[PDB]
Nucleic acid binder design. Structure first.
Ligand SMILES: Nc1ncnc2c1ncn2[C@@H]1O[C@H](COP(=O)(O)OP(=O)(O)OP(=O)(O)O)[C@@H](O)[C@H]1O
Ligand SMILES: Nc1ncnc2c1ncn2[C@@H]1O[C@H](COP(=O)(O)OP(=O)(O)OP(=O)(O)O)[C@@H](O)[C@H]1O
Ligand SMILES: Nc1ncnc2c1ncn2[C@@H]1O[C@H](COP(=O)(O)OP(=O)(O)O)[C@@H](O)[C@H]1O
Ligand SMILES: [Mg+2]
Lengths: 379, 224, 231, 379
DNA sequence: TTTTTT
């Protein structure tokens, strides 16, 4: 009978438009599950798909009135809600989703059944995903410089690799990792490398989430953690000073749960999904308000024992007791890092590490025997 | 079979109904066709049309014609030509594909004056400056300004405001991939061109357009 | 990006339509030959009745060809309207190719526009009933695979205009290992219609789309993706 | 007269559209009452029910403007408001409502007179609702591991079962439950099991609803308890340190009435129906500011005394005092709980407990003989 | 901060 109704049926049954639990509509164009609350992209999808119809149906997809009618007819057919971001082992790029079970990369209709909302923000280029390359060699040299693979530093090396590789899967982490080390050691180097590797799925905020309550008033730092896969906590102030804020334990217990409670400004939605790995960049021994067995199983610490400096204070660096090896500082590193010269190389290294470690299941383990404050309670 | 012979027919699906197609032809001939009843979907390319000339012919502006006209179908358009001496009457073509304003939107987007920036705005190109705005879109202004660089048969439709709104709506539905801006860092954008720095030459007009500079100093460059 | 790719002064021509593939690969003098610009003129002068079909010698070795189009309108057009028709034809064509070269080829839009509207070579048929020509853009270089991909958008443009010249664009020539009749020769021994040059271009070097000579004003663009991912 | 008016009359005759007290228009589609405020669902219902009309009337119901006209005619006939959620012994699903008095599961027209607004969000699968299944065996093993059924843990087990089963009926309760236990004892596992069991009728709000005034200004945490049948307040902070506000007895005494007071942001509605079974997940003994008879009769507490550990801390947990049994920790339990493996088995266990305990009437009784602060008052 | 906006 009707003609535009069949067009709407064809748009619907191909499973291109979906309805989310919050009441928004997600569409599928440019090989990405993009959505806009203010600009409906349904008309764009209709005009883009007009090419896959019989010649007698295309002519009706030119009048803006007819496209609006088709959109209105489509909107009255989505009755059941659909939940998104259910697959925890898929890394979504702008032009497709890269699988992690076998390393293959899908695109188009293949990378569509996995309803991925967030994305890294940049396209995926398979030609730079090779294993042998000068960028690979330079990055391997950098990684072996920051964490030497000696028998004295074997467990620390593999723990560092595991913590870095955990920042890909979208499951719920259950431990907090401290990047505890001295100044000018290479913590920011790893932070920048990870930020270039994963891009948009990486945020860094202040230390207030550790020394403040998370319920009174708004908390925009919590709403920024929705569906993020890695959170870095830098600029942690020293605590041996006067009246310095102490790391509240309750925040640590509340930051490792599948749902963190907190509302952004001018909003009411109080639930948030916690897919983020929390890494804390401190400088000295962290002190808490109270130590208990409930805090014993949510703490992991890695050690950085390689200082970088210019030949000015070379002897001072060589004589210091907190270091293990000192090398020459480089200036162009921060230049080519921001140009993403080690973008896909670090991504391939991370994928290899993830396939090596967490292929059966994902689980982070604590290590309580690395801080003397936690060695006191050995009684 | 016909698939290996030619992918062509006399009336493919997608074309308008034959009665509508003849109606468009009938409006071109301002006078009345005499033998209209001899036409159908199977002989309109052979039957000559004997027009009655009360008013001067709408095609050649002559008082009368010696011989009847005759239709012909090529590439999805009924060309109208006159038998006898071909140079006496000019050539008119009757399109039958689809919407006209859609063609206008396609050909305005073709000249690369409307772009979708990364942040989600709609930059335009008027008065040699990549000006843009969010609260007040300038797409209709761009249409009315660029109506000059289009064929004649498109100017008559870019005057009524509702047609311009329809063209704007069509344009907004074709921009699906975004383009980044401000790639060259050693250029100074002014209100009437872009000034280079490596050699001091001051470009303007189309030449100073590939440098997609969103911002501008706000004043004009006075070479004097 | 060696020396041999920034130049192609060898011309591959045919001698009869419908040459079988076996004769083409064997490259027998009886049907196909190699030529230079000067030698081509002598051959045409010595054979005022011969028929030649310009085509590409090898596909995968050299795909670099100029931009060319074909027009065949079966109706005479008076001089003033012919001039007006050719102005709209170039404006629409130059814009349409530039848009495609910018959206799926990663090239700059304004460089393509300037390089096309500046220097173009036009032919003219000797027939009086119909108006046909071969417009070859002199300073726009690309691969043949680009023209094959461009075939779709050109066809859409030809069916979506009112100008008689641009509506009669021959979009079927864009295929694999195409053939373009050289100016100054017939189509068959029985035909009497040939193409003639037009001012200001007098050299025959301006009418062969296989002649590649990248000068200071030429532009190059091609696809980044290949023809197998474009399903 | 008009043909569309007859369509509106026929749609009104089948009694699928109702006008609620708050002013919303609830519809009946896919065997479940649905509603929305920003985008009314009347047109969706019209299109869905198109099929149940005569032949000459169905084809008239495809053009969007005609559907809008039918909706406009419908909205001019709903003058009387109808209350909702009057049956407190029913568990509505996405494709019907499961009766609790006898275990039957109605659907379609039978499951329509029970005007239930909130729903679990997932469909009912009768195949997995059977008693005998390997999933049931694993779930029973886990439940017995968490709360062993010995004689010393008899009343505690009965209280645990009663409290967990009370989360199904949509009536007003009168006691608060404290899940007291040491570290890694099974509280969060029970929380996640219950959340997977009941689904949407389960929200988790912060601690702010207990120690802060809930009248001045907006408080969306209170506004999100509207018609929910279970509310969890996890991770109560310790009070042995200074700066921690005591638990306001007024807030506890104000959380056990059929109408709590609180408004969401940007709204003037101040009445919230209270069907919630409030359970507090604590780690330490709670402390209050005021104690009287009106508070000791509204507090109940169940104890978890089974510690799940790894072989590393086996001797530490064995010699501890807060534990009565040590068991091997499992890794896949936290993994496959989110995948909804023990959903229907736990639902069947809960409904069996409900029909065993609260079949004549539903009521909770306080047990103030466990808090030392109230033990002093037992004079 | 919210409300007010918009
Ligand atoms: N140039 C013409 N010469 C002769 N008859 C014509 C001409 N143009 C139109 N007609 C006649 O006018 C009729 C009009 O039919 P049409 O399809 O336009 O119907 P309509 O849109 O329902 O309106 P109405 O019949 O009232 O004009 C045609 O069927 C045809 O017989
Ligand atoms: N019946 C069971 N069989 C096997 N493993 C179990 C069982 N019950 C719990 N566990 C495991 O033992 C641990 C118990 O964690 P639990 O849920 O008690 O933590 P919690 O209440 O959040 O802790 P805390 O009070 O320290 O914050 C988890 O690792 C869980 O997977
Ligand atoms: N392996 C390395 N090779 C060369 N330069 C390095 C290496 N590691 C660190 N650097 C240099 O050290 C400088 C400071 O290190 P940084 O990452 O800031 O340490 P931290 O994070 O502890 O402050 C950087 O500018 C970087 O260029
Ligand atoms: Mg737990």
């Amino acid at each position: 009978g009707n003609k535009l109704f069949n067009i709407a049926q064809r748009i619907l049954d191909t499973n291109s438009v979906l309805l989310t639990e919050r009441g928004d509509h997600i569409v599928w164009i440019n090989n990405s599950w993009k959505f806009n609350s203010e600009e409906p992209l349904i008309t764009k999808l209709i005009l883009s798909i007009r090419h896959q119809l019989p010649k007698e149906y295309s002519s009706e997809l030119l009048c803006p009135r007819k496209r609006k009618t088709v959109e209105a007819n489509i909107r009255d057919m989505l009755v059941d809600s659909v939940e998104t971001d259910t697959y925890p082992d898929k890394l979504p790029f702008k032009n497709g989703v890269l699988d992690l079970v076998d390393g293959m990369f899908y695109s188009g209709d293949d990378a569509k059944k996995y309803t991925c909302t967030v994305s890294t923000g940049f396209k995926f280029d398979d030609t730079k995903f090779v294993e042998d390359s000068p960028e690979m060699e330079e990055l391997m040299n950098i990684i072996n410089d920051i964490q030497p693979l000696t028998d004295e530093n074997k467990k620390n090396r593999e723990l560092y690799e595991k913590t870095l590789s955990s920042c890909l899967c979208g499951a719920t982490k259950g431990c907090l990792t401290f990047f505890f080390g001295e100044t000018a050691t290479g913590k920011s180097t790893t932070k920048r490398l990870l930020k270039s590797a994963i891009g948009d799925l990486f945020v860094e905020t202040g230390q207030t989430i550790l020394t403040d309550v998370l319920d009174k008033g708004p908390n925009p730092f919590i709403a920024n953690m929705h569906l993020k896969r890695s959170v870095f906590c830098s600029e942690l102030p020293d605590f041996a000073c006067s009246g310095s804020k102490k790391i509240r334990s309750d925040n640590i217990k509340k930051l490792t749960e599948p749902c963190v409670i907190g509302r952004p400004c001018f909003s009411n939605k109080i639930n948030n999904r916690n897919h983020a790995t929390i890494i804390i960049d401190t400088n000295y021994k962290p002190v808490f308000d109270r130590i208990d067995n409930a805090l014993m199983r949510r703490i992991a610490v890695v050690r950085f024992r390689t200082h970088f400096s210019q030949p000015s204070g070379r002897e001072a660096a060589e004589n210091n007791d907190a270091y293990d090896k000192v090398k020459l500082l480089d200036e162009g590193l921060d230049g080519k890092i921001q140009n993403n010269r080690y973008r896909f190389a670090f991504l391939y290294l991370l994928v290899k590490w993830y396939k090596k470690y967490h292929i059966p299941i994902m689980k982070l383990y604590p290590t309580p025997e690395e801080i003397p404050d936690f060695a006191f309670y050995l009684k | 079979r016909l698939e290996d012979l030619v992918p062509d027919k006399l009336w493919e699906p997608g074309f308008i109904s034959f009665e509508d197609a003849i109606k468009r032809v009938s409006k071109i001939f301002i006078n009345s066709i005499i033998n209209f009843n001899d036409l159908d979907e199977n002989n309109f390319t052979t039957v000559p049309l004997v027009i009655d000339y009360v008013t001067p012919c709408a095609l050649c502006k002559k008082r009368s014609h010696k011989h009847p006209h005759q239709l012909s179908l090529e590439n999805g358009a009924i060309r109208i030509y006159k038998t006898g001496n071909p140079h006496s009457c000019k050539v008119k073509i009757v399109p039958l594909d689809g919407n006209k304003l859609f063609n206008i939107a396609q050909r305005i987007l073709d000249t690369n004056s409307v772009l979708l920036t990364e942040r989600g705005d709609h930059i335009v190109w008027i008065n040699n400056s990549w000006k843009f705005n969010s609260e007040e879109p300038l797409i209709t202004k761009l249409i009315l300004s660029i109506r000059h660089q289009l064929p004649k048969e498109y100017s008559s439709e870019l005057l009524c405001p509702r047609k311009r709104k329809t063209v704007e709506a069509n344009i907004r539905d074709m921009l699906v991939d975004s383009v980044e801006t401000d790639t060259y860092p050693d250029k100074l954008p002014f209100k009437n061109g872009v000034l280079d720095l490596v050699d001091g030459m001051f470009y303007s007009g189309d030449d100073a357009k590939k440098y997609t500079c969103t911002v501008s100093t706000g004043f004009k460059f006075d070479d004097t | 990006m060696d020396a041999a790719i920034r130049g192609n002064d060898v011309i591959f021509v045919l001698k009869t339509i419908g040459v079988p593939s076996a004769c083409r690969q064997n490259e027998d003098p009886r049907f196909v030959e190699a030529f230079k610009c000067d030698e081509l003129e002598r051959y045409i002068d010595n054979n005022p009745e011969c028929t030649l079909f310009e085509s590409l010698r090898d596909e995968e070795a050299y795909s670099i060809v100029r931009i060319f189009m074909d027009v065949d309108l079966d109706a005479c057009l008076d001089e003033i309207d012919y001039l007006t028709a050719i102005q709209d034809f170039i404006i629409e064509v130059s814009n349409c190719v530039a848009r495609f070269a910018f959206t799926e080829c990663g090239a700059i839009h304004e460089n393509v526009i300037k390089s096309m509207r500046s220097n173009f070579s036009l032919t003219k048929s000797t027939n009086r009933d119909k108006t046909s020509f071969h417009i070859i853009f002199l300073d726009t270089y690309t691969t043949m695979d680009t023209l094959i991909a461009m075939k779709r958008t050109l066809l859409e443009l030809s069916r979506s205009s009112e100008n008689p010249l641009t509506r009669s664009i021959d979009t079927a020539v864009y295929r694999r290992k195409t053939t373009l009749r050289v100016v100054g020769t017939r189509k068959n021994p029985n035909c009497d219609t040939i193409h003639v040059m037009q001012p200001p271009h007098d050299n025959i070097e301006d009418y062969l789309f296989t002649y590649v000579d990248m000068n200071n004003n030429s532009y190059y663009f091609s696809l980044q993706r290949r023809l197998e991912d474009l399903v």
